[PDB]
Symmetry: C3
Subunit: 426 residues, 3 copies
């Protein structure tokens, strides 16, 4: 299942055996709520009724403007996360366009409405207060329960300038969301995947407050499309590889900057430089293509042979040999340099390995924690097999007198080109 | 209204036609809540009463210490976001200083109190529980409704170490906030602007828990002053401009780093390097001067002539010709390089343009989405006119043999100085 | 108590007199909730009962997977913030392991349970709904109050993919938390420190939803261990030090990059490059060692003598002489360059100092605000003594013709090595 290799030569590690679920597109749905325009038992409902009016009044000043959004991570492009959503929203403001929906959801709560600009959208009426108020109201406990949802949606939108994420159970109750997934124009694989991970789907969704007109409240829910499912993913962990000379400051370092999540995708490889745009559930990785780069499948060759002629593996250089650790999926990389105390420990047994200077690695099998300096790291105790791939630390292949000691957006070939240049001049 | 130019020569775009609203100062207000010190129907109120006591008790251990706060974005200074607020808070701890406020808000809920260090502050009593408990309490539903606000403010402060933002309707109800804006010593223009955008104002405000002494709870609300309104703003979007040679890795790139929000301000131009410190509502940009740089109005000359002699336009260089896109206000910039598939599409019609290698641009007029590699971007469908300004890609003016391929905090003149130096040596 | 020195020579300032509280380890505790498996007065409880069932049902699809987590800040390592917690969680899934806890908390609510892998954990039953429902239920107001907590924990976990922080009073009520701290295997110093700062402890804790099996709900609370208390801490503030020549762009700059929080720790000094991983309460600094570097105590020598031979003080260079300010603990650093207007002001008196070009500093004593360009900074009005340490701005010691104008990850010796190299070639 989940496995991991460590490369002693490049001070990196790859965790493989993951299955993609990349948000690729968006599905927009219009959620609605129909509204009403209007002793001791009475006075308490008069208070609960003004709560209603206040919520509505508050939702109205909220919509005096169209809703807002305006290592190698810096290489990414720039999106408009909710452009699709808002695009749908601006259409609901058109006259009659509201009345089509008010009409469509008359005998049912869940209908598909074709809109005037050709977007076919799944509409949903999740709360009919008009029906409740105009009849049942025109018991103090009954009303408070029905009204409470309305007020809470109002709180979320008011403190979020009218765009919320993750999408809450107020915006879309669990049962409403699951059923919304079912009636959705997608595959049986997406339907199951989404349904088995509704808490994730929520995190990847947007609730955009839209309009209050003609006794109707509308807000667009922006839901993820996972066009890429069950393709291989692997996570690349890198740590700094430095020399270990005695005199501190005479050392040269080197770090692979191409770390992140990597997934096979449509011939190429989707690269996620910020591995917090990805959420791992067991062996499934949920990613967002908005936060990715599209690289050749040859990018994977840097792992095994960082000197390969097919892809120019990206690194960075420095003379800053500080100690740290990276806690991988199935173990720990340790960069021990200078006078730092770095160890690995078991729970009850205590210290079971003292790391020598340079980049080393230990697997979580038998290890519970890792210490580098004053920093205690707990390792992930997830089940899986590690493979330590012994090799000569490539930092040893460079002569320190002609080693460029402050490159960030660099690569193996760019370093050799700067060495070849400085070598010539000598 | 909103318009946009694309510069084919510098691979950038400027969206103009926006109106400033920059937070420049802060207004502090002291919000108060007066407190009380003390079968089946009874037992439920005994539970609701201990909820009260627990909230108070919790608010008390919370205040055993003074409240806490201690591309070109890295160039910004560093503020103390709530220094003004806390400055006011430390004054309320002085003896008698509480009793002045308890006194002032005796016959009214909204009074201005001059404090001992010369700060004149608008005080506000938004909930008189003392009055309710000592009289009405010393019905089970009535008490729960009145008490509930107190508990919720207590939740917000307890999970936020006593400083909340955005400011909630619990901290300051909509009606309380609007009326607080009205009695505020500001212009008619600020009052209207603030009131039309209370959800934004909330996002730009702070609620700082302050003190519980002498039957009084106090917390300072820190509200934005918009000293700059209705001055021109424009947003600069940049993308990487690379050469497009066949052999991958023989290409040189170049990106304008001076991207962000730009606003006219008091002779100079306020620059916002992190365009997420700015919130756009329709055509109004709300910004924070805390997150800005003060640049000459001559900074705008980089757009039209990046080679102008009046301002040294800031760029960065690399050899990393990866493909991406930037979704502008009224369109999309596309940096297509190497073997990447980049297209633009309409909704129902499909693909309507295939981008060739190099930096190009397309407007949202007729386009719904843009694709660069495995990444689908939706364009903003906001209404407005785009202008494509044809020009020769300046990256072509540089000889690759003497082009500095890893500059970040650089400029046009710094690159020429490094070229002039390396040229001489040859 | 709290004091501060400014170094005119290096354009930096150090605020000293703080007391450490560094999270070093984690304490895991298993919180439980025991569950039940099953006219006008009746119908409302039938609604409150399905709320129960819905919450439970929702908590169940939430746990179809193991919970998720997968200037000089870039030098830090990488942790697995909740690895310890999840490590404990995966154990509760083992058969019988639940039934041990269900058993242990039969006659009490707070017991220590040894688990099958040798971890001794403090278990806690904070809500016995099984007892309430199977007896009292098998009044409409009573049930709603008891049930409400359950629903709210369910909301927190559902919108957070099952991992929450800060830990709320729903997850662990104030009284439950304090008492959990008391029965904890730690010192009298940690117990008092933790208890006096429960709002902070909450911010530094994790609530990880774990399991629903055998009428039991379990979630692990991950609580901080403060192994380092009451050791000296100091905060280093740096600002750019540039020359002040007339012709703009002929100036060279220099900034100390080693800014952050610094604390004495076990022979070495814990360095916190991102001073927002640290929370200051009065004179106590709460830090996380996960976000730190372990440096020699000789790092403090850069303050007084940045040219000292014991530690290679870290700086960065540029030619970007933009004006800004840094608001220190007891004052303000001002970097005024070019045509910028920089001043310092009192509240009622107005402007009391106009800053000349170059890096200067003013103390909060008598000053309320500082202005640099269009940016108004309020200074922290915290009480304490400042010391201005006059010295020659070291940027004057460098010849601009051979000054490396774009170094980031550099140091005093690396700059001299690049100068010595370029000097030789001339
Ligand atoms: C210059 C500068 C200013 C601010 C930041 C971010 C501040 C952290 O919050 C950074 N990034 C962190 C960071 C950490 C180590 C870095 N090392 C470098 N290389 C120095 C560039 C100069 N080159 C050319 C001249 O001769 C010396 C080497 N850069 C510059 C650099 N940086 C990026 C992201 C892309 C391309 C690039 O050449 C670094 C940036 C860099």
């Amino acid at each position: 299942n989940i496995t991991e290799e460590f490369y002693q030569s490049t001070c990196s590690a790859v965790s493989k055996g993951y299955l993609s679920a990349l948000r690729t597109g968006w599905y927009t749905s219009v959620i609605t709520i129909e509204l009403s325009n209007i002793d001791a038992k009475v006075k308490l409902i008069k208070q609960e009724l003004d709560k209603y009016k206040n919520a509505v009044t508050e939702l109205q000043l909220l919509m005096q403007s169209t809703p807002a959004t305006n290592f190698l991570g810096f290489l990414l492009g720039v999106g408009s996360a909710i452009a699709s959503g808002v695009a749908v929203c601006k259409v609901l403001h058109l006259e009659g366009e509201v009345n089509k929906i008010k009409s469509a959801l008359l005998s049912t709560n869940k209908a598909v409405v074709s809109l005037s600009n050709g977007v076919s959208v799944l509409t949903f009426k999740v709360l009919d207060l008009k029906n409740y108020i105009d009849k049942q109201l025109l018991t103090v406990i009954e009303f408070q329960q029905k009204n409470n949802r309305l007020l809470e949606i109002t709180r979320e939108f008011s403190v979020n300038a009218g765009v919320t994420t993750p999408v809450s159970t107020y915006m879309l109750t669990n049962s409403e969301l699951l059923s919304l997934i079912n009636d959705m124009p997608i595959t049986n694989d997406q339907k199951k995947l989404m349904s088995n991970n509704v808490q994730i789907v929520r995190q990847q969704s947007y609730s955009i407050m839209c309009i209050i007109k003609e006794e109707v409240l509308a807000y667009v829910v922006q839901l993820p499309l996972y066009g890429v499912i069950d393709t291989p993913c692997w996570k690349l962990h890198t740590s700094p590889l430095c020399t270990t000379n005695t005199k501190e400051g005479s050392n040269i370092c080197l770090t692979r900057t191409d770390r992140g999540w990597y997934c096979d995708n449509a011939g190429s490889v989707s690269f996620f430089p910020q591995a917090e745009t990805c959420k791992v559930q067991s062996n499934r990785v949920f990613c967002d293509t908005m936060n990715s780069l599209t690289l050749p499948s040859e990018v994977n060759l840097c792992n095994v042979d960082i000197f390969n002629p097919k892809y120019d593996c990206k690194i960075m250089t420095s003379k800053t040999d500080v100690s740290s650790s990276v806690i991988t999926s199935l173990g720990a990389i340790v960069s021990c340099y200078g006078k730092t105390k770095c160890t690995a420990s078991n729970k009850n047994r205590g210290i079971i390995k003292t790391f020598s200077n340079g980049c080393d690695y230990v697997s979580n099998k038998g290890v519970d924690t890792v210490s580098v300096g004053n920093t205690l790291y707990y390792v992930n105790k997830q089940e899986g097999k590690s493979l330590y791939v012994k090799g000569e630390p490539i930092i040893n292949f460079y002569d320190p007198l002609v080693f460029p000691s402050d490159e960030f957006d660099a690569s193996i070939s760019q370093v050799n080109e700067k060495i070849n240049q400085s070598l010539a001049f000598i």
